[PDB]
């Protein structure tokens, strides 16, 4: 399936995943398209910030959803 | 009067506005314009985070001001 | 050395820099050739906010690092 992410710099990315992709797997996608490592990424969806071990399934993140990737802030 | 609204990817909107709205007023105004759910939103005045009961008048927001408008983080 | 800054909608600057500069030099350079006044630049490294009075030595900053600017949020 497909779903799309929004950048800073003003891109859609579209992005072929599945249901029981990780987010994890969906940043190494991101890398692959965009090049920025998986450790500087952090995934908002419906304002929520997706976790690295859960799936897209756990967060109800169906066909065509948007995601928006910002910075990964963490505090120290 | 008129204010910017700088997007994510740095658009600016420009918006007619006047002193007494609220800022769920100018969040209904990008909506009508840009489609983007007042829900999603979130605004920033230099700095501040604008609440939605507040009004442009109450933050010191004047003619020809720029706000950012940036993603509304929740939990969950 | 030289280090890279991403801009809030990610244009890449060059910076020419030593270690032993401080956060607060470095946005003395970003003010030099953006125009952003320092107090409203905030810049992260590895996910962390960076103090103006530490040094690029003190966060392990090394030549060819990428540093990002963000929106600069403040209370009340
Ligand atoms: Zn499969
Ligand atoms: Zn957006
Ligand atoms: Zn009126
Ligand atoms: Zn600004
Ligand atoms: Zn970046
Ligand atoms: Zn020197």
Same mark, same amino acid.
């Given at each position: ?9 003003? /891109?859609?990315?579209?992005? !072929?995943?599945? +249901?029981? @992709? ?5 940043? *190494? /996608?991101?890398?692959?398209? !965009?090049?920025? +490592?998986? @450790? ?5 969806? *419906? ?30």
């Amino acid at each position: 399936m497909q779903i799309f992410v929004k950048t800073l710099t003003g /891109k859609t990315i579209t992005l !072929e995943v599945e +249901p029981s @992709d990780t987010i994890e797997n969906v940043k *190494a /996608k991101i890398q692959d398209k !965009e090049g920025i +490592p998986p @450790d500087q990424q952090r995934l908002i969806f *419906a304002g929520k910030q997706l976790e690295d071990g859960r799936t897209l399934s756990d967060y109800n993140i169906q066909k065509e959803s948007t995601l928006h990737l910002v910075l990964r802030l963490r505090g120290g």
